[PDB]
UniProtKB/Swiss-Prot annotation:
The name this protein goes by in its record: Microtubule-associated protein tau
Assembly and oligomerization: Interacts with MARK1, MARK2, MARK3 and MARK4. Interacts with PSMC2 through SQSTM1. Interacts with SQSTM1 when polyubiquitinated. Interacts with FKBP4. Binds to CSNK1D. Interacts with SGK1. Interacts with PIN1. Interacts with LRRK2. Interacts with LRP1, leading to endocytosis; this interaction is reduced in the presence of LRPAP1/RAP.
Residues carrying a glycan: K44, K50, K66
Record-listed Phosphoserine modification sites: S2, S21, S49, S53
Cell compartments where the protein resides: Cytoplasm, Cytosol; Cell membrane; Cytoplasm, Cytoskeleton; Cell projection, Axon
Species of origin: Homo sapiens (Human)
Amino acid sequence: GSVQIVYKPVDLSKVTSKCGSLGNIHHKPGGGQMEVKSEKLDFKDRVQSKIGSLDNITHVPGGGNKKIETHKLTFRE
């Protein structure tokens, strides 16, 4: 009772971007007034939280392209 698993994927893929000038970008958030009170917090096992947070972000990548790839082989005799 033989088993023969040939896992041979081929990826010749391309994620490409072309762009002229990138610019003249203005991000002017108005100021914040923030009051947080937190009494009894209990986080466990891959929690990702924000409370009363203020985040101003300007993100301007020339490319910003992304390729994600997961291969997975699971064998159980």
